[PDB]
Design a protein around this ligand. Structure first.
Ligand SMILES: *[C@@H]1O[C@H](CO)[C@@H](O[C@@H]2O[C@H](CO)[C@@H](O[C@@H]3O[C@H](CO[C@H]4O[C@H](CO)[C@@H](O)[C@H](O)[C@@H]4O)[C@@H](O)[C@H](O)[C@@H]3O)[C@H](O)[C@H]2NC(C)=O)[C@H](O)[C@H]1NC(C)=O
Ligand SMILES: *[C@@H]1O[C@H](CO)[C@@H](O[C@@H]2O[C@H](CO)[C@@H](O[C@@H]3O[C@H](CO[C@H]4O[C@H](CO)[C@@H](O)[C@H](O)[C@@H]4O)[C@@H](O)[C@H](O)[C@@H]3O)[C@H](O)[C@H]2NC(C)=O)[C@H](O)[C@H]1NC(C)=O
Ligand SMILES: *[C@@H]1O[C@H](CO)[C@@H](O[C@@H]2O[C@H](CO)[C@@H](O[C@@H]3O[C@H](CO)[C@@H](O)[C@H](O)[C@@H]3O)[C@H](O)[C@H]2NC(C)=O)[C@H](O)[C@H]1NC(C)=O
Ligand SMILES: *[C@@H]1O[C@H](CO)[C@@H](O[C@@H]2O[C@H](CO)[C@@H](O[C@@H]3O[C@H](CO)[C@@H](O)[C@H](O)[C@@H]3O)[C@H](O)[C@H]2NC(C)=O)[C@H](O)[C@H]1NC(C)=O
Ligand SMILES: *[C@@H]1O[C@H](CO)[C@@H](O[C@@H]2O[C@H](CO)[C@@H](O)[C@H](O)[C@H]2NC(C)=O)[C@H](O)[C@H]1NC(C)=O
Ligand SMILES: *[C@@H]1O[C@H](CO)[C@@H](O[C@@H]2O[C@H](CO)[C@@H](O)[C@H](O)[C@H]2NC(C)=O)[C@H](O)[C@H]1NC(C)=O
Ligand SMILES: CC(=O)N[C@H]1[C@@H]([C@H](O)[C@H](O)CO)OC(C(=O)O)=C[C@@H]1NC(=N)N
Ligand SMILES: CC(=O)N[C@H]1[C@@H]([C@H](O)[C@H](O)CO)OC(C(=O)O)=C[C@@H]1NC(=N)N
Ligand SMILES: CC(=O)N[C@H]1[C@H]([C@H](O)[C@H](O)CO)OC(C(=O)O)=C[C@@H]1NC(=N)N
Ligand SMILES: CC(=O)N[C@H]1[C@H]([C@H](O)[C@H](O)CO)OC(C(=O)O)=C[C@@H]1NC(=N)N
Ligand SMILES: *[C@@H]1O[C@H](CO)[C@@H](O)[C@H](O)[C@H]1NC(C)=O
Ligand SMILES: *[C@@H]1O[C@H](CO)[C@@H](O)[C@H](O)[C@H]1NC(C)=O
Ligand SMILES: [Ca+2]
Ligand SMILES: [Ca+2]
Ligand SMILES: [Ca+2]
Ligand SMILES: [Ca+2]
Lengths: 390, 390, 390, 390
């Protein structure tokens, strides 16, 4: 008799380590016999028995003849797909959940919820799937590419919370939260505070009372908007992270944005989804983040950590925890997720490593995983191993 | 231990939306490494735990060397196959249930019933398979291509009802209904009324007492024969759908078949299996239908709806719900089906999108799925994304 | 709490029909992207939940580079493999059970028993596998290719009975039966009567007290040795079938072997494994057989039936029940097996259809299935659909 | 609910036989359509319900374009992978557990423990995974390639014991033992005695009180270090195997290392992981070993056995049991493992058969399995059947 899931205390440990590389295009040469799917925006969500590796496919494999368009964001062909984590996401291994050029998913202890956005840019559509069944939708409210998290949503006691946003990518994008229960949207939550532009939130439980999200401002700042969501009152507030360690790409030099914590500063235009995940201890909360090694390119990926504090108020630099992806390798999207051990939760960060050779060739990604395990210092970086000319 | 299933009230909603595209020949290019099966006549049937995607394969894959003959209807190699819905129907993924060039399937709540017709045109044979066991057959009664629904049969209380027919494609084809229980035919039902040509019925539950079917007349009319089958007395009547919105292809202009409801009118020769699904509410019943956008060609697919009334007597046009497949794209067979959610049923329509390059190349199909989903208006159409020269 | 299996009454029906074709090399062209395994001697065995399709592979696929030797019988590479019945036995779908150039398998209600013979011709070795575990062996006793049934063994109340034989293929091959329980050989049974040459027995339950086998004499006669095994006393006796319808290939004209029932007659040299399966009714036993359409070649396959009687004594011709494989198509090995329906057993005959193009090319087989279903007459024959030049 | 597992008495038997060959590169020809993974260091571990086949992959398939580097030992792409035993380790079939260039695994009766070492040579990291959760790590203690067994670890009562080592391949490598429970290291065991070089131990249960291991010394001797680990006091001693039958490769002539048991002798530099498995009977213990047929090259593989005695003190030659792999074929790593039968344990030995074409082509391995099975003498050897030019 399956019960509702709740966030548990995190497992012991004080450092991340390289766990797993999922690099489908290691097998996509013309000399070869495999059919890895062309994908971007991967993320991982785990239930009580299984981990699922999600992505947005372009509905084409490599090698193949439909490369043209695979460097685009949205079209009528993109689908949310998944494999069990640890499987190579090929044509045959994958399962196609729904049409979607923006997605999310989560397990509530009883059943998977799948979330997909599709439709025309000026009138997109959020779709909710619970198990096999399509159960609810939510309409565009600003008529400017309604879109969601591109990472796991979060469930507590059967209630799943999901960030959505709608609005110009170079102007205002006031985000909303949806409270979804058993596939049906039972409440809209309208955040207060600094709501100018929030998107692609990476969200997790700081506790049984609070969800926290580190998001992307693609318009005004290289500081990440940081959401605190009270799950007991269904209220949310947004403020920019204050840390000198700006987590967006592009970004100016750390600590160079002058004025109070709310100051936007320079190099704010553009952005990237950033990894964020909680380490819940008896009396401390650990906050782990990732950002690219380069200040302007999607190259490299570093891990940072800060225990305790108010992310809205602490200007202190984050503690650099190690290089996950070298500056010589691609470092694009990253995301947090949690594996369920028998009695506690294991916090992890996944990294999207995009193979980018321009619009004249195929365009896809690998996925690297780092997880909290043991003590000491982070020891090894991840390479993709792929030569795009093969 | 599993109980029999019964139609339930539908889930809330007032519009369909694009749910899912299964386009396996996106992976069938010569530059690729995949092996999608060559198929036609796909449909979907759902049990308590799982949805299955069925089709009739020509026992060949693309790329391959057995294209010749795949634009034919019947031969000794055609088989009923399936995959879990969301998987691509490939050589390795598919399961082959039985030899068949006409098929159906349904879950009674305990077990799958598979239905496959094959044999010679003048003496074909319907075969029943219950799980893994072949359990029963039914013989041609007119010696002119015994054939069945090409979509899910319907179970209630362990009783599964199935349309069969026999007779000339261009003359009389009096259908019958088989009542089937745990794989064995226990009753034949002889419909009453307008009985001279009924084939390829798409059937569903109007309630716990009635099954309704919208069918194809390939010979006499562009109106669809409309079956009402009483499940409490095991009796059935057929009359032509009265609606001005003629659902066959080909068909004349809407409302142009003059005279009383049973008038056949012109452009009646030829036809196509149409989508039909029920939206069951407490105090009213919604009927959803699909037809091609072209009045003569198998191009496009539009969605229509009417609430309540009697389809035998009401001439009112169906309300246009939206374009599922634009007229630039192929729109062949369509079928109804329902997904079992936790406490209600989700009504859906699937669309066969045939890749037709003539008899000089391969001939197969993609499948699009639209489902009842939230409110508002239908928002996006479907394309297969397939170039047949690849 | 799984219980021991017993033979049950057969399901109703009075004729066989074409059920299923498994034709892996429909997908093995150079133009294609699949990897069907090169196999011969298929057979099927069913447990209470699943049907398994077994074969002896040459550990090579098509297309591939190891064709040379695939027209041989024995080597160090042959393995017993299986897939779930209904799956194409490819490199990836198959599972490799054990090294074997001769095999059998059966389910006892609790667990699969797998049986494989390998080793040098003059000192071969029967190996028994119960589930994952290798559990017992049995040595050559005549030092002339110890070999087994190439079809399902038979289990009652946890005891599995298996025919084995050892001896020259052009002289004496006194067979033995092994009683195997939970993977261990607990008794040898030495048949009496006509024991000169028995091999490749196709065996089944005539009742709870008796196993019957129709076997192959590759040396002295075109009559099939016919075994009756008393399961309650563990005693077996062998006599030639008496029917005018000689079931071996090659064979003289029916009814042309003069003298008493035991007379060997002409064209006795050579042979073929023949399908045989029981139809158990309340007071009748039905016996179904298959033999090639040609009297001298492995071409075509016909179905025969006789109700009741003593196969040792009745000279009456068997009743011809229909053409399963045309004389224009290959008809090699055939075998009986039974599917388990919910409350009764479904008798079936499988047919090996070998693609034979000589030693200069690849050498493999398809499998066709006919099962007892409904009434009337057998309606359609099976073709393989394969062009070996592709 | 599942109970912890404990070594049981072995099943009856007095000889090994050829059981199974896993030769995936039989499907790796350029004329083919398959994608076997490039792997080395395979081993097998069995739980209550299933046997798993593990290897270290170079994250590449054959045919492919990443052959370069697959004859190297360590890199950032190597992963621990597995399939169900009897499946071919291909891109689609394999599951990727974690990044590792050194590995182990074992089932405690409730769950799988996976072990993978990676990171830089001077600072490598052992990672523990319990089911799907990363649960613990252990750091290099000598900064000279921390590494582990390359074969199954051993569990008793929920306690899993694992050999690790660290130090120069050509100097001192003092191993340790990790006691692991539900994924977390709870004790380090520091062996006593002849401790200067111990690596790649093949371990099994001599009883409920003792684990024994036959290990590799790559530096000093051709005798195998022999670990006795007491599981009741968690203490361990290592001495050199005294037997005249030296089990390493390279090695001098048998019995030619003069002097007392702990004498190292000549040709000690270099080495190879050897097969070792226990045959536990009521009143006696059988120890089965394997070594290459060549005294210097990794060619061939022979089987040896001794009952009882003390391997630290007895100089008696082991009894030659037979040739598993002829000297014409490659014989690289060998490993012990046990299959769980219903009431007893089946001892087995696996053999890595490496396809070595030098560094100018691909580099990978097949796996042969021999098992305790009936009585008599071992009857057949194994060949891979693979031509590397294809
Ligand atoms: C067609 O007929 C079907 C069979 O009569 C109808 O299904 C029945 O629907 C009613 C209400 O919609 C259900 O009664 C409710 O039961 C729930 C609890 O559900 C379970 O209860 C126990 C477990 O405690 C279990 O034994 C049952 O089998 C249910 O799984 C209560 O909370 C409600 O208060 C109410 O009593 C019936 O259970 C259900 N029967 C079956 C066999 O499914 C169906 O509604 C009809 N379709 C229509 C009208 O369109
Ligand atoms: C190492 O220690 C292990 C744990 O002490 C030993 O395993 C034990 O072995 C004994 C006999 O070999 C078993 O006792 C027998 O039990 C069977 C019935 O088996 C089941 O009984 C009940 C169900 O009725 C269930 O609760 C149990 O868990 C068993 O599954 C009886 O028929 C016999 O008469 C006898 O009592 C123990 O059950 C078994 N324990 C465990 C935990 O497996 C093992 O033998 C030792 N290894 C050696 C000595 O080499
Ligand atoms: C968030 O809230 C959930 C639900 O309240 C917390 O889960 C609950 O955790 C407690 C203690 O960890 C569990 O209580 C029980 O305690 C006894 C020991 O006396 C033990 O034998 C039981 O097996 C169990 O551990 C309770 O079962 C559990 N409930 C659920 C539904 O999971 C969770 O710990 C909270 N997260 C925090 C505080 O970070
Ligand atoms: C061969 O022997 C087996 C074992 O004796 C026979 O199976 C047994 O069949 C009987 C009757 O079919 C089963 O008895 C029970 O009868 C009541 C009706 O009063 C019914 O409610 C039960 O569910 C069951 O049918 C018995 O359970 C069953 N036992 C086993 C272990 O299967 C089998 O019928 C014999 N085959 C023949 C005679 O051909
Ligand atoms: C496709 O198959 C059909 C029949 O299966 C082929 O038709 C035959 O063509 C030859 C000439 O090439 C005629 O002599 C036969 O009489 C035809 N048979 C039938 C039944 O029509 C056809 O040639 C094939 N097409 C291709 C391109 O190979
Ligand atoms: C295999 O890979 C190695 C290194 O990964 C290649 O070695 C390099 O070769 C170039 C010349 O072609 C040298 O300039 C580099 O210094 C070498 N690097 C190292 C690390 O040795 C090697 O060429 C590759 N082999 C093939 C056949 O491509
Ligand atoms: C049994 C059979 O062959 N049915 C045909 C065909 C049919 O001839 C018409 O319905 C007229 O009776 O309709 C459709 C069609 O595309 O029109 C293909 C079907 N293909 C198959 N289901 N195989
Ligand atoms: C950790 C590691 O790299 N072990 C090596 C190698 C090793 O260097 C020796 O044991 C000496 O210490 O042995 C064998 C070998 O073939 O000799 C390959 C191993 N390959 C790997 N397991 N990756
Ligand atoms: C198109 C869309 O819905 N999301 C975009 C996203 C976007 O343009 C920015 O966040 C601005 O709002 O940018 C990223 C990106 O790589 O920068 C790709 C995303 N692609 C998809 N998720 N498909
Ligand atoms: C080699 C062996 O063990 N059995 C042979 C079998 C045999 O030669 C005759 O039965 C005579 O005894 O003939 C048949 C055959 O096709 O005629 C192939 C079998 N091939 C295999 N089962 N592999
Ligand atoms: C493919 O490239 C051609 C090049 O002219 C362009 O016209 C077309 O729009 C591209 N298709 C897609 C789907 O991007
Ligand atoms: C392959 O054919 C060659 C041709 O001369 C022959 O020498 C060899 O024995 C054959 N191999 C096998 C395995 O039959
Ligand atoms: Ca920004
Ligand atoms: Ca018509
Ligand atoms: Ca003969
Ligand atoms: Ca050595």
């Amino acid at each position: 008799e399956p019960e509702w899931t709740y966030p548990r205390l995190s497992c012991p440990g004080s450092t991340f380590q390289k766990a797993l590389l999922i690099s489908p295009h290691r097998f996509g040469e013309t000399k070869g016999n495999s059919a890895p799917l062309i994908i971007r925006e991967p993320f991982i969500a785990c239930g009580p028995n299984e981990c699922k590796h999600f992505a947005l496919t372009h509905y084409a494999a490599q090698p193949g003849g439909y490369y043209n368009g695979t460097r685009g964001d949205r079209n009528k062909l993109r689908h949310l797909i998944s494999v069990k984590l640890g499987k190579i996401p090929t044509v045959e291994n994958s399962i196609f959940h729904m049409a979607a050029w923006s997605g999310s998913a989560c397990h509530d202890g009883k059943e998977w919820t799948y979330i997909g956005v599709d439709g025309p840019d000026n009138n997109a559509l959020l779709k909710v799937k619970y198990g096999e069944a399509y159960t609810d939708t939510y309409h565009s409210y600003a008529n400017k590419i309604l879109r969601t998290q591109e990472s796991a949503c979060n469930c507590i006691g059967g209630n799943c919370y999901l960030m959505i946003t709608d609005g110009s990518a170079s102007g205002v994008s006031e985000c909303r939260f949806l409270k979804i229960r058993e596939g049906r949207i039972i409440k809209e939550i309208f955040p207060t505070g600094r709501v100018k532009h929030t998107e692609e939130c990476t969200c997790g439980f700081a506790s049984n009372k609070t969800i926290e999200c580190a998001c992307r401002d693609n318009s005004y700042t290289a500081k990440r908007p940081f959401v605190k969501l009270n799950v007991e009152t269904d209220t949310a507030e947004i403020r920019l992270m204050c840390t000198d360690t700006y987590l967006d790409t592009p970004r100016p030099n750390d600590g160079s944005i002058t004025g109070p914590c709310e100051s936007n500063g320079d190099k704010g235009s553009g952005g990237i989804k950033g990894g964020f995940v909680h380490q819940r201890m008896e009396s401390k909360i650990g906050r782990w983040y990732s950002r690219t090694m380069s200040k302007t390119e999607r190259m490299g990926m570093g891990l940072y950590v800060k225990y305790d504090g108010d992310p809205w108020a602490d200007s202190d630099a984050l503690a650099f925890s190690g290089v996950m992806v070298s500056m010589k390798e691609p470092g694009w999207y990253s995301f947090g997720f949690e594996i369920k051990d028998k009695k506690c939760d294991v916090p992890c960060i996944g990294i999207e490593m995009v193979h980018d050779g321009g619009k004249e060739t195929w365009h896809s990604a690998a996925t690297a995983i780092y997880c909290l395990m043991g003590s000491g210092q982070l020891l090894w970086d991840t390479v993709t191993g792929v030569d795009m000319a093969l």
